[PDB]
Amino acid sequence: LESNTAGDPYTDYEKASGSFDKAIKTEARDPLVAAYPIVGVGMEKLIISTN
Amino acid sequence: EDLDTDNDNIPDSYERNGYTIKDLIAVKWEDSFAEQGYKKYVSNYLESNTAGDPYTDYEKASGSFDKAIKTEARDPLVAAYPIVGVGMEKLIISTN
Amino acid sequence: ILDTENESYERRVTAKNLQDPEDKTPELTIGEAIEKAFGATKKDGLLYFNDIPIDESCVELIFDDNTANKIKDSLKTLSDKKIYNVKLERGMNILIKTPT
Amino acid sequence: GDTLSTIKAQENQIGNNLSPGDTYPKKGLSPLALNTMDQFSSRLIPINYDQLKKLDAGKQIKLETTQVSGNFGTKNSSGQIVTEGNSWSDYISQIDSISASIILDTENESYERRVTAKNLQDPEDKTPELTIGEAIEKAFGATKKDGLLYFNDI
Ligand SMILES: [Ca+2]
Ligand SMILES: [Ca+2]
């Protein structure tokens, strides 16, 4: 009843057939799983300039 | 009649004899809607906008414009025209 | 313009000029123009907004100098001699203030 | 009793997403800072000596939200959700004009719904007439047991 089962921009047929972006992990092939990056930022260290 | 010299949805016989809008269509006036709530609009049949405001005669009469406009601006003769003004309250002077 | 207590109203009403006939805007008397542009109610010949009457004998009604001259020119050439029956003309800055 | 300054979040304080019932700095993180004043995020809010003395004396300074602007999401010909030039400011005035507000203030939560109401002054509006109780039930998803309204257990 919905074009996108998961909610991600690619539709059911596009996700199933693999006619979408080729850098996406196979775990997102089936419609139930969603293509969703969780990009995060890891701090390494600060430098303080004393003016 | 059927003449429409201004290309709106109100023909140029009701536009000068008196018309009222019901069920999104214009009908003639016979005063029987007097004790029901309907008003009597009369406009100009040679211009699309009788008053000059952006909304046309049919849009103003039916009520298809922005739903926040006061009913006083309903009929074509009255014009939708904000009079926005600025009222000053106080000052603060920073002495440098 | 109406200037009731702690409120104001600044309506505009269309007027027709008879000096060059191509406009077909209906001619509006000032009283019915007020009752049209303010949504007033009529009981038997009097105008009520909500509970404060608006009438020539119940309000303070002020013109500009040019508007007053136009009104005076269009009263001695009539019979009723009541302002609320005067033909509207372009450039008329009426101001109605209801009593306290 | 005199406003200090009005500021609109320019680029470093814009909340990309706000789902109902959730804060923008989602719970667990820290609040966000609001220092810059100009458009291109390069200025600081200045105050003078009298206001600094009033601040240090013990007076409390308050922040009050004046307005909010943000888009909503529609669908184009494709299945792509589009949020561009869809400002809620286009509908705020009309929605507040033609509807009545209902507020619920349960513990550590709030609800701010709007319900459409019909005026009987002109025979053109055809919105169905709503009583207060059934409007509350409709706009809160409440449940009826035998004549009483329950939201979850209250
Ligand atoms: Ca016409
Ligand atoms: Ca017309």
What are the Cα distances from residue B39, in Å, to A7, A20, C11, C36, C67?
50, 60, 19, 10, 30
What are the Cα distances from residue B74, in Å, to A18, A43, B64, D71?
57, 62, 10, 30
Q: Length of chain C, please?
A: 100
B30: CA distance to ligand 1 center in Å? 19
The per-residue b/e assignment along B36-70, b for 16 or more CB within 10 angstroms, e otherwise, is: eebbebbbbbebebbbebebbbbbbbbeebeeebe
Closest C-alpha among B12, B8, B13 to residue B62: B8
Interface test mutation site (partner C, options B72, B75, B84, max chain C beta carbons within 10 A): B72
Torsion sign over Cα D147, D148, D149, D150: negative
Helix, strand, or coil (residue B78): strand
Closest ligand to C-alpha of residue C24 is: 2
Contact between chains at C24 and B75 (C-beta distance less than 8 A) = no
Query: Following CA atoms D37, D42, D45, D49 in sequence, which dihedral angle do they give, to the nearest 10 degrees?
Result: -150
Closest C-alpha among B57, B61, B78 to residue B12: B57
Which residues are CB-neighbours of D7 under 8 A, at least 6 positions away?
A: D34, D37, D45
Cα A11 from chain centre: 14
Which residues are CB-neighbours of D85 under 8 A, at least 6 positions away?
A: D71
Helix, strand, or coil (residue D102): strand
Alpha-carbon span D9 to C96, nearest angstrom: 44
Cβ(B71)–Cβ(B29) under 8 Å?
Answer: no
Reported structure resolution in angstroms = 3.6
What are the Cα distances from residue B56, in Å, to B51, C38, C45, C90, D118?
9, 20, 32, 21, 25
Q: Which residue of C has its CA nearest to B12?
A: C24
Six token digits for residue B51: 């008053």
Q: What ranges in D46-110 are assigned the alpha helix state H?
A: 49-57, 89-98
Q: Quickly count: other Cβ atoms within 10 Å of residue D58's Cβ.
A: 6
List chains touching C (3+ CB pairs under 8 A). Answer: B
Cβ(C62)–Cβ(C99) under 8 Å?
Answer: no
Six token digits for residue D113: 């719904």
Contact between chains at B71 and D97 (C-beta distance less than 8 A) = no
Instruction: Tell me how far apart the terminal alpha carbons of chain B are, to the nearest angstrom.
Output: 75
Closest C-alpha among B26, B30, B65 to residue B43: B26
The experimental technique used to determine this model is cryo-EM
Burial of B73 (0-12, 13-18, 19+ CB in 10 A): buried
Distance from CA of B96 to the nearest CA of D (A): 8
* Partner residue opposite D48 with nearest CB, options B66, B90, B94: B94
DSSP state for residue D32 in the 8-state scheme:
P
Cβ(B26)–Cβ(B20) under 8 Å?
Answer: yes
Cβ(C28)–Cβ(C17) under 8 Å?
Answer: no
Alpha-carbon span C9 to C7, nearest angstrom: 7
* Partner residue opposite B50 with nearest CB, options C12, C14, C36: C14
Alpha-carbon span D75 to D102, nearest angstrom: 30
Alpha-carbon span D136 to D117, nearest angstrom: 12
Alpha-carbon span C54 to C43, nearest angstrom: 12
Number of H helices, E strands in chain A: 1, 0
Q: At residue D88, what is the residue type?
A: W
Closest C-alpha among B19, B44, B68 to residue C14: B44
Cβ(D5)–Cβ(D45) under 8 Å?
Answer: yes
Cβ(D151)–Cβ(D142) under 8 Å?
Answer: yes
What are the Cα distances from residue A5, in Å, to A8, A13, A20, A27, A34?
8, 10, 16, 15, 9
Contact between chains at C22 and B78 (C-beta distance less than 8 A) = no
Closest C-alpha among D137, D65, C25 to residue B51: C25
Six token digits for residue D67: 């307005």
Contact between chains at C25 and B44 (C-beta distance less than 8 A) = yes
DSSP state for residue D27 in the 8-state scheme:
B
Q: Length of chain D, please?
A: 154
Phi, psi of B63 (to 5 degrees): 105, 35
Six token digits for residue C78: 């009539």
Cβ(B78)–Cβ(B61) under 8 Å?
Answer: no
Contact between chains at D93 and B68 (C-beta distance less than 8 A) = yes
Q: Quickly count: other Cβ atoms within 10 Å of residue C70's Cβ.
A: 18
Pairing of strands C41-42, C47-48: antiparallel
Alpha-carbon span B75 to B85, nearest angstrom: 25
Alpha-carbon span C77 to C87, nearest angstrom: 12
Q: Which residues from C are below 8 Å from B5, CB to CB? A: none
